[PDB]
Structures are given as C-alpha cells and as structure tokens.
Design a binder for this molecule. Structure first.
Ligand code: GBE
Ligand code: CL
Ligand code: NA
Length: 472
C-alpha cells in the first residue's frame, strides 16, 4: 500500500518556457529579461550560453508531446512566455503567433490524452516591464492581472490547472545581486522584498480575476508554486530548532503565510526581525513593505492548491550571518550542508530524500493540510544516459512522498518531475543536466532520447507503484 499511488494522483513532467523554447525573437515575440541577460552579460552564464535556441520547443513541441506520451505522463507542466503573447508586456498588443503556438501545444497534449498544467510566470519578464523597475514596482500587479486575463480567455476552456507564479523566492533574488538571476540588480534586503510584495499582490489579483471572470464557466483550479528546502536542526537544541523555523518562515512563509493561512499577512517573525534590524541600522522605515488590513483580507485564501518545488535540504543552526542588509541576514539562521549527503552536479543540491517527507509534514501542519501538487523535483548530473544517480533520486523521493501520503496523511495530489528534458539551466547554461530525456545541443535537430530515469519513471507511471527492486 505505501508503495502504490492513489488512484486519482497525477504523474507527469515539467518544463519552463525560456529553458526550452528558443525562437527568442521569432514571429513577433518581444524581448524578456533573460534575452537581455544572456545577450548583454554572457559573463554571468556558464559558457556564455543563451536560450536563443535551447531545446527548440517552439518548433519541436510535437516531439515534446511524443516523449510525454512515451513516458506515460498524465500531466505536462509548462510555462507561457509573457513576451511571446504580449510582446510589449502591456495588453495593448496580443501576438497571434504566440496564441497559436500555445493553442497548438495544448491541443496536441489533449489529443494524446495528456492534461496541460500552465505556469503563467516562470521568470521571463518582458523587458519593457523591467524598464519600469520590474517586480519592485507595484504597478506590475495590474499588468500581471491583464496578462492572466489574456491567458484565461484564450486557453482556459482547455486548461484547468494554473500556477500564477513559479518560485518567487528565487526570482526575487534577481533584485539582490548585480551578477545573478535576471534582471541582476543589486538591491538585497530592499528590492527583493519589494518584488515579493508585488508578486503576492499580483497572485491575489489573478486569483480574484479567475473567480470573477472565468471560474463559473471554466471550472479549473489556480495555485502558486513555491520552492522550499528542508532545514534540519544542526543539533537537537531548542535554539537550533528556532533557527530552522526562522528558515521556513523566511523562505516558504514569506509567500505562503499571506495566502494559505486564515490570518494572512507575512509571518510575525519576518515582520519583527526586519523591523528590528531596520531600526538598528538607522532606517526611518522598515525595509519590509506592509499590507493594509484590507489587503491582508484580499490576499488570504487566494488558492485552490499549493504547488511545491522540492530539491534538497540544509542544516540550520542558531545565529546570524550574511551581509547587511539581506534576506539571509534578516532570517537569523546559519545554513550549511552535511558533507555526508550525496552530491549532484549542482553545488546547492544534495540528495536528502527524508527532507522531502519532513517538509511535507511541516506544510501539512502550518497550512492545515492544503492539497499539494509537487510541481518540481529532480536531480542534476553533467551528462550520460545511464543516470543511476537520477534514478535513485527519483525512487527515493517518490518513496518518501508516498510515506507522507499514506503514513502521515499529507494531501499530495500530483507530481511532475523536473525536467522532461535537459534544458537551459539559467546561469549554469547547458552545463548542468536535469532532464529525464537527454538533448544533443550540438545537433540542430535537438533530438530527445530517453535516459534510464525516463524508463524507470515510465515503469512507475505505467504500474502506478514503486517497483520491488527499489523498495527498502
Ligand atoms: O549555486 S548557488 O548557490 O550559487 C545559486 C543557487 C540558486 N538556486 C538554484 C536552485 N533553485 C532551485 C529552484 O528553482 C528551480 O530550479 C531548477 C533547477 O535548478 C530550475 O531549472 C527550475 O527552473 C526552477 O524552477 C533556486 C536557486
Ligand atoms: Cl525485480
Ligand atoms: Na486576446
């Protein structure tokens, strides 16, 4: 029983637009912040790589559907490129080519019995909107609503699973470093918090828009995808446990407390620590933006499920480190990783499968057991089809998730592997491979070929259980 997926549980795979599509300036698509970063700042990216072509999924979407069908995916999570649909960011111009492209992909998926799950925003902001300041500028919340309206109107008759945003914990960090994630702006502890504030507002507007303009007719569900690492106390002390709770609230709670709790607002520890630190450093005003009571009420409850992106764990101990000002310093935890944990091809990613079960329980307890859809989980290597590390990563994480479901009563409703195929891994270029399908980036045809992990995942999806040879 503990090895069997619930009957209604949805299994599949995931991608994101900039990471796979290419066709960066084709047929009316406007420029986004990742076009800008990779073109203007190739020194920020391994190999000076760009997403100009990537997997060429703009042209090769039928091949993506073919491999999803081979895999036996029930659901395909993909993102829509804002600047492909609205090249100017604002909704004055709708690019029919972009509408046609996503309709073509959606229709191809449905014709092959695969359900689309659409992420509206997976990091590729139109440059025209970044030029207003991007996410720190609250005007983007209305722009986001208008973008979502176009998506719901055009695609919502066939798409019943939506994520407003993918992992704003990461993309807010594009406003906390001059050399990091797009748009690579150095306003740590200030602009990243403003970005988070706008995103939360935007998410809430999009959810209310769905309620007001689309839900009665379309009958779908709207969530948000949040990335969170498990944070394990470095020792069993109360003080180290406090530091790990700080971590959860500063990383997951920053977004999830306003939306998924009955109280709403930011977590108290976030408000209080930032207020204190801001005062001690001489600011008249806290660096953390505030919600009014009306805004708190508007934002809380804006969810039909919680998307979780889970990859790894950290150790946390009591203390403070990091630069002043910064979110890490404000969070009041000292983070490390255990040397004993198995490694990947990504410095940040260690294999800690039991951390997944711990995190699912933390979420259950904090947010009253919301329906949780695992929108990303996966593992990097540098190449190869006999990807034993990836196979082990998936079988262990899926076992831990199944224990969370069956033993712990966590309402997990679906799981999409990150990623369907090797793709453009942001600042790591094509150097780190997360796919279950390999892609030859030196071959203009970009063939997708199954790794051992794709074969094992297909077996899991077909049998709806963890095969005996992978059980404890
Ligand atoms: O090495 S450093 O410590 O100097 C920088 C680390 C930056 N992290 C990397 C991991 N990412 C996880 C969630 O982000 C996910 O990560 C996947 C794999 O990376 C991406 O492909 C997906 O687009 C994304 O949603 C959050 C940001
Ligand atoms: Cl066997
Ligand atoms: Na339209």
């Amino acid at each position: 029983t503990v090895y069997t997926f619930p009957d209604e549980f949805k299994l599949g795979a995931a991608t994101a637009s900039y990471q796979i599509e290419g066709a960066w300036d084709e047929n009316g698509k406007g420029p986004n912040i990742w076009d800008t970063l990779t073109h203007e700042h190739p020194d920020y990216v391994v190999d000076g790589a760009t997403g100009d072509i990537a997997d060429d999924s703009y042209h090769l979407y039928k091949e993506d559907v073919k491999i999803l069908k081979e895999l036996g995916a029930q659901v395909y999570r993909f993102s829509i490129s804002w600047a492909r649909v609205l090249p100017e960011g604002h909704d004055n111009i709708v690019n029919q080519d972009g509408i046609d492209y996503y309709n073509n992909l959606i229709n191809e998926l449905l014709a092959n019995g695969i359900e689309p799950m659409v992420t509206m925003y997976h990091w590729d902001l139109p440059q025209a909107l970044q030029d207003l300041g991007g996410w720190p500028n609250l005007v983007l919340a209305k722009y986001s609503e208008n973008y979502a309206r176009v998506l719901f109107k055009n695609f919502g008759d066939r798409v019943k699973l939506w994520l407003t945003f993918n992992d704003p914990l990461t993309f807010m960090d594009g406003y906390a470093s001059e050399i990091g994630m797009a748009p690579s702006i150095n306003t740590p502890g200030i602009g990243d918090y403003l970005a988070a504030h706008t995103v939360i507002h935007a998410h809430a507007r999009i959810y209310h828009l769905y309620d007001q303009e689309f839900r009665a007719e379309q009958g779908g569900k709207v969530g948000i995808s949040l990335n969170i690492n498990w944070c394990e106390p470095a020792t069993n002390s109360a003080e180290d446990r406090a530091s790990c709770e700080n971590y959860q609230q500063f990383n997951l709670g920053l977004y999830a407390h306003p939306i998924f709790t009955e109280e709403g607002d930011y977590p108290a520890v976030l408000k209080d620590r930032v207020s204190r630190n801001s005062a001690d450093e001489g600011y008249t005003d806290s660096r953390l933006p505030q919600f009014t009571a009306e805004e708190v009420e508007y934002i809380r409850g804006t969810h039909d499920f919680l998307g979780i992106n889970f990859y790894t764990a950290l150790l946390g101990k009591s203390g403070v480190e990091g630069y002043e000002p910064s979110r890490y310093r404000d969070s009041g935890v000292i983070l490390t990783q255990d040397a004993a944990w198995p490694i990947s091809a990504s410095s940040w990613l260690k294999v800690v499968p039991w951390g997944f079960r711990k995190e699912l329980n933390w979420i259950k307890n904090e947010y009253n057991n919301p329906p949780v859809f695992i929108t990303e989980n996966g593992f990097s290597d540098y190449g190869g089809l006999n990807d034993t590390g990836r196979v082990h990563y998936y079988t262990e994480h899926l076992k831990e998730m199944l224990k969370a479901i069956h033993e712990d009563g966590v309402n997990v409703i679906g799981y999409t592997a990150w990623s369907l195929m090797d793709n453009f891994e942001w600042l790591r270029g094509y150097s780190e491979k997360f796919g279950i399908y390999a892609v030859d980036f030196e071959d203009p045809a970009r063939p997708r070929i199954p790794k051992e992990s794709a074969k094992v995942l297909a077996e899991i999806m077909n049998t709806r259980k963890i095969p005996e040879r992978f059980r404890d």
